Every structure is written in C-alpha cells, then in structure tokens.
Write a protein that binds this DNA or RNA. Structure first.
Length: 256
DNA sequence: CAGG
DNA sequence: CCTGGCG
C-alpha cells in the first residue's frame, strides 16, 4: 500500500483555487496534501476549500492577515497535530504543522524568507535552529519523521540555475547552505537526491522576467526523512508541469 | 503598499 | 510579477 504525499507552496490558496487547484487535487489523489504560504485564515476561504471530499482538513494561519500560513488535507486523520516548537515568536506565523500518524510524524513547514532584512535573516536562521532541535528530540525518542515544505534555501550549486550571482543573496548564503549540511549530517536524507542527481531540477521561479519558461529556478522545496526511515521511501519527484503559483508541487511515495 |  | 486596505 503506497502512501502518496504532496507538498506545495501555493502562495495564496484563494488565488490557486481560482486556477483549478481543486480539479488538480481531485485527479492527483494524494493520501496527504501539505500546503504552505496559504495567505488566508480559514474564515476567509471559499467553503469548497474547507470541506473537501474524502479529506480531513487542518489550517494553521498566521496572526498577520493575508500572510504566510500552512494547511494539510488528509484522507486518514492524524492522532494529534502540533502548531509550534514551543517558542512564541516562531509559533505565531502560521509556519508549523506537525501531524502524528502511527508510523511517522509529518512536518509540514513554511521556513522563513531571509531577503527582506538582517532581522528576518536572523529569524530564519534561529527558526532553523528551533526546528532542528525539535526534530532531533522526536527522532531521538525513536520516532520516524517526514519533513516537507519550503526551506527557502537551495542546498548546493546544482540546486539553482544561477549560483555565482546569488552568493550574497539570502537563499544561497554560505550560512544557510551550511545549516542544510548540518541538518543532513544530523541524520536526515534529501529524498529527491536519493533518486535524481541531474541539474535543472527546480521548484521555484521568479514571476519577474518570466523565469519559469526558461527553467531559471531554484529547488527550494524538499522532502526529507530520517536515515532510519529512508528504506521506506519509494519515489521522490517534482511536479514541474503544475501551474498556479511560482512554486510547483513535489511528491513522495512511501510504502508501509 | 508589503512581502517574496 | 503576483498576491493579498483604501475611502
């Protein structure tokens, strides 16, 4: 029994609903759908998005309206859902869903963007620190974990079309890049790179200069698992053809 | 406008 | 570029 999970930074769920989100959702038929950057509290949503056929839905909006926020739809409900790491400033931004299924915890995370200021870059970095602490504590206790979402960082030079020009841009800073290295050596696998070693694999493209039609992008969106669980991951792929956002969806198939 |  | 309070 393959379990299919999809992660998609929709950048406005209302927007993506106007562009055929539900029709796509319906034909893709994942067991779990994780969304990031919803930009909506549930009360602001068309009610068709709040009552989807065959799915439990959970929304974790930001305190600031039309900003950030994450969501999850799941055929099988989780036994619990956490919306924070237990640190106020990281828990108030609609950035975290940690859902408990029997066999694993699923982290659906919208990691912060650091481009706006030094203050937000710090925030990004410390959020990473709080995140790593949290996941380590969980897998240390013997839990197997799946982590998807917008990390807002391209790991290596191969993970973006233009590495050289972005050395001094948040998204490809040596400090952000080293954190992913750190995160990985803590015992986690970048599951896409388990199966695909090719360049040109991106999940985000600038709307400006129409970067997507030339594949001038970044791989900002990932599925990670803890090392002990990697033998369960069957497929890890990018849904490059799917439109409606400046990010595309990514997929994971595990079999338990 | 702010955020990305 | 695209999304999401004016007044």
């Amino acid at each position: 029994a393959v379990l299919k999970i999809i992660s998609w930074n929709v950048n406005g769920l209302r927007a993506v609903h106007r562009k055929g989100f539900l029709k796509w959702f319906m034909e893709e038929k994942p067991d779990i759908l994780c969304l990031q950057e919803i930009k909506a509290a549930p009360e602001q949503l068309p009610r068709k998005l709040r009552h989807v056929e065959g799915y439990r839905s959970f929304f974790t909006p930001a305190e600031r309206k039309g900003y950030s926020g994450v969501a999850m739809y799941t055929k099988v409900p989780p036994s619990s859902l956490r919306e924070g790491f237990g640190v106020e400033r990281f828990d108030t931004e609609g950035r975290i869903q940690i859902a408990d299924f029997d066999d694993f915890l699923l982290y659906n995370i919208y990691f912060p963007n650091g481009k706006m200021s030094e203050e937000r870059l710090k925030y990004k970095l410390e959020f990473y620190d709080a995140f790593l602490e949290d996941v380590n504590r969980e897998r240390d206790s013997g839990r197997n974990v799946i982590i998807c979402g917008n990390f807002n960082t391209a790991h290596r030079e191969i993970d973006l079309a233009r590495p050289k020009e972005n050395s001094n841009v948040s998204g490809f800073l040596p400090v952000e890049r080293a954190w992913i290295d750190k995160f990985i050596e803590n015992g986690y696998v970048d599951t896409f790179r388990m199966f695909n070693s090719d360049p040109g694999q991106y999940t985000w493209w600038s709307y400006r200069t129409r970067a997507r039609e030339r594949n001038v992008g970044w791989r900002l969106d990932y599925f990670f698992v803890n090392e002990e669980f990697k033998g369960k991951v069957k497929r890890s792929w990018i849904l490059s053809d799917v439109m409606g956002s400046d990010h595309c969806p990514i997929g994971l198939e595990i079999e338990l």
